[PDB]
Amino acid sequence: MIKLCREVWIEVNLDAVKKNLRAIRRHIPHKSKIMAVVKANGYGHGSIEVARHALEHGASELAVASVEEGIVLRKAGITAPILVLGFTSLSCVKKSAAWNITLSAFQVDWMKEANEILEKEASANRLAIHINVDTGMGRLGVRTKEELLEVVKALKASKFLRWTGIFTHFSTADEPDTTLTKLQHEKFISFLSFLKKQGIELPTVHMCNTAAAIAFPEFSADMIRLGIGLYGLYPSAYIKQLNLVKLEPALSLKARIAYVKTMRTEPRTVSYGATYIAEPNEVIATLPIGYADGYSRALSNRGFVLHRGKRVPVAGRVTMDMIMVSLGENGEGKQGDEVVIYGKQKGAEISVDEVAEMLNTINYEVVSTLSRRIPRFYIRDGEIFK
Amino acid sequence: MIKLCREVWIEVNLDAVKKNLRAIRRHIPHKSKIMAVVKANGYGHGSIEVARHALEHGASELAVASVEEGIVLRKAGITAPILVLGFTSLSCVKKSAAWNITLSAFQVDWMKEANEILEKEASANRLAIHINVDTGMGRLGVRTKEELLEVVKALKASKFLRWTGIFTHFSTADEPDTTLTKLQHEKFISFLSFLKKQGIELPTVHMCNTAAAIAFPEFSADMIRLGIGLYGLYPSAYIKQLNLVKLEPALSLKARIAYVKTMRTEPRTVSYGATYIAEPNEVIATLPIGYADGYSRALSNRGFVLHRGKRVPVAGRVTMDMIMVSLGENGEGKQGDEVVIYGKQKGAEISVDEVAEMLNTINYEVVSTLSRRIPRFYIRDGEIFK
Ligand SMILES: [Cl-]
Ligand SMILES: [Cl-]
């Protein structure tokens, strides 16, 4: 089984990941490609094994948050295109060209300076560029067709850059009111059409995230960017209730009980602040996960974990490295028992959507703040590896 | 200055760690050693460089959450004693003896099993053990004098273990009500004196955290465990208000503006959910930090950052890798401008403590969930490195 000194770990089910890709591949047009988004350590799931697996099973490109995340995938042996979705400093142009990481860019000046850095070094690859068109996200990208033309001309003139994509991001494709999504789409389409009647041939057009690919597959164009759906999580309850694509959650968080005790002697106080007094024959188990792992301190006296198919409440405050749970009066549990923090156990389930609802956040945050000091184990074809 | 592809980073001021150590050193009895707690990646500050500096400037021993965290320190050359505060599986007894990591234990079965594991391996290293006495934290550790005596006996009868410490943890030493802190101390003393009355000589006795080292320095005994105070952060407003010791915060969290734009064209929506709509002449600056870095999504439309010495509000929802801030109508910013997320800038300051109140949590969680994908830079004698 799993041998740890500190007995907490994550299981990422790569069979779920494969299934999530085939579901998306079969929903969207057959012409359209899939870009798997493995930024932020694969939304907390591990970027290397999820990328490796997604490229095996439907994906042809990868997207990350930064050059460094991209280089980690190159060092793992991955030769697929890697697109950086955020901003990359000019000081990393040489390094991105060296690792063949595709950069997002959306400014004329950035293009020219990037091109000179690369020509002043000669012995270079050409740097691939995707243009980010901002159609309503308000984050990064060009916002007018005149500015976009300025950028495409600077890029087309730059001998050491290469134009391989143009994209936009929908900010509300996960919501039932579609008016803003439809507006983003026709803004984008009108921009691409403006470029076409200049006689500018277009590269790969991509615009859909998980929500837009499920809800508007006709927006798939050349490529979609599969993020949250890849991990078997729906972008929102609304997208989930559309019941168009069946996704299967990939991540489970588990631990083993570190210690069990009956609270016979005084004081029967539990954890910092003594916010929880146990009963004389109440049984308190101590678990080796804490808020420094990403298990929110807000789950103090609120959270549940699965122990032997039953939900047992977190007792007292979450500590940096450990939590106490109440097994009840004369509760049954032994040191070493397997506890499920996120995931399924026997009948019962604590999904990350539930923990995210209970914390007034979204599943995206619950999984991508899972600390890297938690080891990740991958299940593929029933069997565990690392 | 600092050259990053993704222009976010942490600065840890080791000169401030030095000062916090001296401040604590003058405040506690000369007999008592200082054990620096660097568990959870040094409370998010980086375990290695903080430990190296602590041992250089007054700390004699280290404490971590797990054997894995101790091995990281040993791999970096640190030879000081290292105590694991948490529970270590029996499957790591041999590894702990090889790396000379000190474990806490509090069970007879664990002692006997740990001993025979090293026995069956003809081990030359005796495994250092500290006994954890639970006097009201209810987390780990032995709870009665009879059980503790049996544990001491099993330890002493174990030729391959070495008893190097006994300790307890204060549940509420950071609160105005000292009732439980006095009670735990009284229990702890009575147990040690119960042991001494049995012809047992005690090893290093330690019990104080930052709070109790500040508020009850007469509890210093042989050694204190300096955690949050090492990083320049007070355990509570109460302990800060007692104005007994002057701590200097060691962490700042900074970034560089990735893009600046005036929201002249429609739509003027900013970020997911279109929860913020800009004015036609409002300046929106995009920053490369997001919830996956540890910047809570709950700061959406509520947090501030420092630009040119001014607090500017987070605009719209925090996204995984980026936030948007409003520089106001006709605001002044350039791409590349340095922004302070946590810490000091010109006159102003966003302290980790303010961010913690804003999120209904404690500074421990704000700092120890700063993600590892953010590079840590170390300032020692007013000069940076990594
Ligand atoms: Cl964007
Ligand atoms: Cl404890």
Swiss-Prot record, chains A, B:
Protein name, UniProt field: Alanine racemase 2
GO MF terms held by the record: alanine racemase activity; pyridoxal phosphate binding
Protein family (similarity comment): Belongs to the alanine racemase family.
GO terms for cellular component: cytosol
EC numbers on record: 5.1.1.1
Task performed by this protein: Catalyzes the interconversion of L-alanine and D-alanine. May also act on other amino acids.
Catalytic reaction(s) noted: L-alanine = D-alanine
Pathway listed: Amino-acid biosynthesis; D-alanine biosynthesis; D-alanine from L-alanine: step 1/1
Keywords of this entry: Isomerase, Pyridoxal phosphate
Residues engaged in binding substrate: 139, 320
Domain of life: Bacteria
Annotated organism of origin: Bacillus subtilis (strain 168)
Positions of the catalytic residues: 39 (proton acceptor), 272 (proton acceptor)
Name of a matching Pfam family: Ala_racemase_C
